[PDB]
């Protein structure tokens with residue numbers, strides 16, 4: 186059976202983007218599965234396919250294979266191999282073992298929390314391969330949980346559920362991250378609270394020291410935990426009471442009483458703090474995605490610029506600004522243009538300490554822009 | 568005596584850019600020197616000034632000071648302090664001690680080569696302060712050389728010369744960089760051959776392993792030296808026979824017998840190697856700046872694309888591409904859009920391994936764009 190795409194889809198696969206949408210599929214199989222994709226009689230790639238979804242084609246190979254399933258599982262082995270080294274070296278750490286498209290494993294994500302892996306499948310073809318996935322993980326873990334309750338599964342016509350796949354899945358797990366530890370919650374109705382894409386950026390914070398630090402959009406307090414090691418006072422701000430509860434629990438776990446949580450609207454607080462003359466030696470801005478769609482950019486840009494402008498005005502000379510965006514539509518060029526505008530408007534000279542982004546376990550593909558969503562930059566006020 | 572700027576010049580300084588051109592200077596001193604800059608009666612900054620040049624104002628402080636000379640030398644002390652830790656642990660290394668505007672020391676650059684400093688000044692005010700610069704460096708070095716032959720000095724009406732300022736300056740010195748050593752020529756007529764802005768990027772390459780590596784635009788062969796310890800064969804390519812002579816010399820100094828130099832035109836060679844069916848496990852592209860002015864960008868972009876497209880085609884699956892640009896006007900956004908275009912045209916999927924640039928000793932200011940000129944990225948063919 187073959188999937189036939191139009192010229193538009195052909196140009197996309199030739200450029201090595203991994204997605205072809207339904208409107209560009211001329212014909213294809215009646216059921217979802219793994220099939221070769223063609224432009225006329227020309228082979229283009231092997232892909233996960235679903236005839237009932239908007240994102241119909243997700244490529245994983247750009248060369249033919251006698252056994253599509255074997256090929257896909259080869260990609261799985263290759264992804265795990267890239268993390269082998271770090272798992273033997275840092276067994277109690279938190280790492281992503283499989284990052285979907287980035288690892289040429291569209292529709293599959295696997296996270297590792299101190300020996301306990303959590304699998305999330307969002308493409309129909311993976312469902313029947315979950316047992317093989319669990320066995321591939323076995324050599325590296327104590328247990329495997331199938332957390333398959335993401336709403337995206339509804340699009341693929343998949344059932345929603347959360348069930349163990351291998352071993353005994355614990356309710357909570359302590360993860361070591363540099364000089365601190367945090368508690369992950371593997372239960373369905375509870376916040377996992379790991380946010381691994383920021384693992385390296387959080388560790389990077391350990392090199393800074395000072396009197397007062399402000400962690401805006403603190404969510405589970407990860408950045409705050411690391412800042413507490415070098416700062417006298419760390420204020421963790423977030424509008425989620427539940428998130429701040431986790432933050433307080435993680436601080437307690439580390440015996441870090443110098444972290445105080447504040448339930449408030451980030452935007453209002455920043456302006457208010459500046460109004461009453463409060464100053465900080467470091468501010469971390471890790472807001473949720475301000476721009477969902479490509480049409481939200483203009484408005485998002487203004488929102489980012491405002492929060493960054495207010496953060497910079499709170500900094501003393503020598504102050505540190507750690508700012509990020511996890512909106513893939515807020516492109517890296519737009520992001521840095523925005524911080525430059527905020528700095529210019531605040532009349533503060535900023536030196537670039539470091540331009541970062543996603544860690545090695547959250548791979549980015551140059552040819553597939555959507556894989557690059559996180560930007561993280563650190564600056565110092567001169 | 569003060570420098571008076573118009574509204575436009577004032578807005579530039581308030582946004583914290585460090586330059587104000589002659590067109591925006593309303594009035595100023597009759598001779599070059601260090602003077603405060605004002606917009607009306609409002610103090611804006613302290614700056615190096617020259618009433619005879621297009622780039623009239625170069626700011627170094629945005630706060631007043633009784634003694635402008637003392638303030639400037641204070642900036643010098645602070646720049647050196649930022650390198651004290653690395654000089655203490657790695658005395659035989661090569662580091663930039665002063666990076667002009669980036670260190671708020673406009674018109675001054677100072678490099679350190681295993682205990683021997685080389686000073687290059689391009690602004691009039693620095694000429695009279697050379698002895699004080701030498702004294703500030705005394706605690707950190709064995710000798711200090713004034714390499715003041717850059718033609719840009721003619722714009723400031725300064726003499727061109729090369730002379731020692733402190734100690735006994737050797738003709739050449741060996742510098743240790745990771746697992747390799749290279750020879751620096753301090754003589755006025757020879758190529759220095761250090762290229763310190765690429766130091767950390769060269770070191771980053773020591774982690775890769777493979778059979779054959781290709782170092783294009785090799786210059787003194789720095790990248791090839793680091794690759795030699797990880798690859799069976801390394802081919803260094805450059806159009807300059809003199810440059811390759813230094814390359815062989817460096818290879819010999821390290822006892823590296825797996826590095827072969829090849830005098831050829833990069834563009835021509837890459838195509839021929841492609842047609843010849845040649846393939847490599849790693850290719851490094853470190854071309855000279857293809858763009859110097861903003862008008863050279865359109866054709867420069869095309870040149871970068873061709874060499875990157877050819878390099879990508881030479882890589883085997885799993886191959887590593889380390890590519891760079893030192894053209895300031897070939898902005899980061901244009902650089903990455905260019906590599907993406909090359910990959911798309913080559914029908915090759917690239918994973919982003921790392922996005923780097925200038926190391927800590929070559930500081931970048933967000934508000935002063937011209938300080939950022941180097942882009943270095945590493946990708947892997949999937």
Ligand SMILES: [K+]
Pocket residue numbers: 370371372373374375376377
């Ligand atoms: K959970």
Ligand SMILES: [K+]
Pocket residue numbers: 752753754755756757758759
């Ligand atoms: K020289």
